[PDB]
Paper text:
This 21 kDa periplasmic protein is a dithiol oxidase that catalyses disulphide bond formation between consecutive cysteines of unfolded polypeptides as they are translocated to the periplasm. EcDsbA consists of a canonical TRX domain, a hallmark of proteins involved in redox homeostasis, with an inserted helical domain. The TRX domain harbours the conserved active site CXXC (C30-P31-H32-C33 in EcDsbA) that is featured in many proteins of the TRX superfamily. The acidity of this groove originates from a cluster of negatively charged residues (E24, E37, E38, D44, E85, D86 and E94) that map along a buried channel in the interface between the TRX and helical domains of EcDsbA.
The other three mutants, [name], [name] and [name]/[name]/[name], were crystallised in space groups P21, P212121 and P2, respectively, with four molecules per asymmetric unit. The crystal structures of the three mutants containing the [name] mutation showed that the shorter alanine side chain at position 58 significantly expanded the size of the entrance to the buried channel. In all three crystal structures, a glycerol molecule, used for cryoprotection, was modelled into the electron density. Additional water molecules (labelled as w’ in Figure 4F–H) were modelled into the electron density in the buried channel in all the lysine mutants. Conversely, introduction of the three mutations, [name]/[name]/[name], resulted in a less oxidising redox potential of −139 ± 1 mV, 14 mV lower than that of wildtype. Mutation of two or more of the E24, E37 and K58 further increased the “disordered” solvent content, reducing the structured hydrogen bond network between the charged residues and the w1–w4 water molecules. Indeed, both [name]/[name] and [name]/[name]/[name] mutants displayed significantly lower thiol oxidase activity compared to the wildtype protein (although the more reducing redox potential of the latter would also affect its oxidase activity).
Numbering used by the authors: 1 to 188
Write the structure that this text describes.
Amino acid sequence: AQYEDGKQYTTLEKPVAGAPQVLAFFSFFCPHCYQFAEVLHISDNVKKKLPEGVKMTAYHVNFMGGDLGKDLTQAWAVAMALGVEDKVTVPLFEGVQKTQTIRSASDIRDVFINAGIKGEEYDAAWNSFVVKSLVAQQEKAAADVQLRGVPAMFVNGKYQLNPQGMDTSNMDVFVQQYADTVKYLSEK
């Protein structure tokens, strides 16, 4: 008795086959997503508690931020294909919401260059078929879970995290409950 349907998580009435084990949706434009990444470190605490062999996957979404938003979804596809997610997450969140220095496709690419990805490697990745495929895959996954806002996280294409049923008086306690719920669900 400590993780309950309708409280810490909910059950998709419309389950999704072939979904990533643990699938997070976020936007670099989203203040809640910045809170999750930069203050709560949700993703990192989830990974710390996941059983062995369960992976976490994170997709960017487009319904925030207009054309930069779409650029950032493709830039995230680049990050996924070059395996540099953890080098650009922080400079992108801060670039968008904290200093607001990211305001065109060009400023996104600079974040990557300053994180070590050579400009020309970024460009090839940007125009590649694999990145195009990953942009469409992020979009297909969001439609498939009928995504209406971010942040959000889904386990085995069946369960949705419900932070609204979680204690938020203590940030550390919130983060452990959330991470413990993901771990619990990954084992259902």
